[PDB]
Design a protein around this ligand. Sequence first.
Ligand SMILES: *[C@@H]1O[C@H](CO)[C@@H](O[C@@H]2O[C@H](CO)[C@@H](O)[C@H](O)[C@H]2NC(C)=O)[C@H](O)[C@H]1NC(C)=O
Ligand SMILES: *[C@@H]1O[C@H](CO)[C@@H](O)[C@H](O)[C@H]1NC(C)=O
Lengths: 21, 48
Amino acid sequence: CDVVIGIVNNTVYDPLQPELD
Amino acid sequence: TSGWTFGAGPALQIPFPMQMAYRFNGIGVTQNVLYENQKLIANQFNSA
Ligand SMILES: *[C@@H]1O[C@H](CO)[C@@H](O[C@@H]2O[C@H](CO)[C@@H](O)[C@H](O)[C@H]2NC(C)=O)[C@H](O)[C@H]1NC(C)=O
Ligand SMILES: *[C@@H]1O[C@H](CO)[C@@H](O)[C@H](O)[C@H]1NC(C)=O
């Protein structure tokens, strides 16, 4: 995420990680 | 400013760089090809 112009910072939710862990 | 939306109803604004990316998607090209090369495509277009 350093070549596209206009990127914003946000969280991407992975459904496996919480339930799995 | 609105691509092709105004011909089917109300004009819906969307940034032009994003308009071009949808147009590459319509021909089977993945949309990151524009977003990572936006300057190259715009400069090459302007000369063409
Ligand atoms: C999006 O997040 C990244 C990572 O946290 C930010 O990059 C940091 O930016 C600060 C200045 O705002 C620098 O001091 C850090 O060195 C940067 N970190 C890295 C790893 O490069 C980035 O600035 C954020 N973007 C926005 C618009 O806030
Ligand atoms: C959008 O334009 C503003 C000025 O109106 C500029 O400050 C900003 O960097 C531009 N955003 C992008 C993603 O180029």
